[PDB]
Amino acid sequence: SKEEVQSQGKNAQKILVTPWDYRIPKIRISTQQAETLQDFRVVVRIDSWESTSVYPNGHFVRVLGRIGDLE
RNA sequence: UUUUUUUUUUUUUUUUUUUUUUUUUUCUCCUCUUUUUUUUUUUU
């Protein structure tokens, strides 16, 4: 959310993403569009679980629809 | 009743060349609560 992105900097490489089912951990991905996609669902995948992190790493895949409209 | 003389617009043209997007950082990060997980069935 915004008040916790304006504090990430403005070139915040690393970012944390919240999944949609409670069964899945949170994922560490690196993007540079976080301050203009705070009203959309997105999609990611997974390449490698690393042990120097408590979470698994990822990377963005494609955009999805908008939060609020049935589509 | 007033003669004679005092040059002018730099000369030159017939020289070879075998490279190539970019370029250089920013750390670790507490996801709150009825559950085992329901399940046949038929009309698309």
β-strand pairing of A27-30 with A14-17? antiparallel
User: What is the C-alpha to C-alpha distance for residues A40 and A47, in angstroms, rounded to an integer?
Assistant: 23
Report chain breaks in chain A, C–N > 2.5 Å, as residues after which they occur: none
Determination technique for this PDB entry? cryo-EM
Q: Can you give the distance from the CA of residue A62 to the C1' of nucleotide B31 in angstroms?
A: 23
Own/partner pairs, A22-26, CB within 8 angstroms, 24+ separation: A25/A55, A25/A56, A26/A55
Nucleotide with minimal C1' distance from the CA of A13 is B26
Helix, strand or coil, per DSSP, at residue A3: helix
In angstroms, what is the resolution? 7.0
Structure token digits, residue A19: 């999944």
